[PDB]
């Protein structure tokens, strides 16, 4: 009956001052598991873009919401926890050729 995004933890940051660090080029992983990883933030991240976590596992943001961003991990989710930094590479899902 309620909604996600702003809930308990995410609802206590907008009442004071949610700034300082940039939330467009990077993002915080709020929930991860079974390959999926809900990253809170990444406003400048485009669709189907390559995301790099703080542990070294790559990610692909395929579901962009208004408060979160569902990214699919390309490896193992055993090293990704809650609150990890998820940086954006700036490009899409590319591969080598030649």
């Amino acid at each position: 009956k309620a909604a996600p995004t702003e809930v308990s933890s995410i609802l206590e940051s907008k009442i004071r001052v949610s700034d300082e660090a940039n939330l467009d080029e990077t993002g915080r992983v709020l929930s991860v598991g079974d390959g999926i990883a809900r990253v809170f933030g990444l406003n400048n991240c485009q669709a189907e873009e390559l995301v790099e976590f703080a542990s070294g596992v790559k990610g692909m943001a395929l579901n962009l919401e208004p408060g979160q961003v569902g990214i699919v991990l390309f490896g193992s989710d055993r090293e990704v926890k809650e609150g990890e930094i998820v940086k954006r590479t700036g490009k899409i899902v590319d591969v080598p050729i030649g």
Binding site: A2, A3, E6, V7, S8, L11, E12, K14, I15, R16
Partner: protein, 163 residues
């Protein structure tokens, strides 16, 4: 800082999140009187409750433009930030649930409850509930107690079922 009071987890997390930042530099006594003025001027008035059930508005009278709905009322410290979070997340319809959860935190860490029977209990503010319940039950049984029940109805039903 999270106090052990649980209070649901999803709907009751609105007042518990703002209580952590409001418990610094002694800013908890002024929040009790400011929360009662916001609910008394939107319920028994039938004037400012025109946008309580409608899904329109969209930043027209809820946030930004206030003036008389914040400065002239009873809001100047951290009371203005509680109404701005409910207008953007569409939570202005349940204003009574956010104000009721704020008074339960002050009555748990600085008071007591546990109502026995008849009416209410004494709600002491000493320490433990062992020596406070024994000294308040003898002083309240003699004074008053009209007795106009629960223990007499349970004993009468057990004797008729075994007939």
């Amino acid at each position: 800082i999270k106090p052990p009071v649980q209070l649901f987890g999803l709907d009751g997390t609105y007042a518990t999140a703002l209580f952590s930042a409001s418990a610094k530099d002694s800013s908890i006594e002024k929040t009790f009187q400011s929360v009662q003025k916001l609910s008394s001027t939107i319920s028994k008035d039938a004037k400012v409750a025109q946008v309580l059930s409608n899904p329109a508005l969209s930043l027209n009278s809820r946030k930004e433009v206030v003036s008389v709905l914040s400065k002239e009322l009873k809001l100047e410290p951290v009371v203005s930030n509680l109404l701005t979070v409910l207008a953007e997340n569409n939570r202005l319809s349940l204003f009574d649930s956010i104000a009721k959860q704020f008074s339960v935190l002050n009555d748990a860490y600085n008071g007591v409850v546990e109502a026995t029977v008849v009416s209410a209990k004494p709600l002491d503010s000493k320490i433990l509930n062992r020596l406070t319940k024994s000294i308040t039950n003898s002083k309240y049984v003699g004074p008053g107690k009209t007795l106009k029940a629960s223990k007499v109805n349970k004993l009468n039903k057990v004797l008729s079922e075994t007939i």
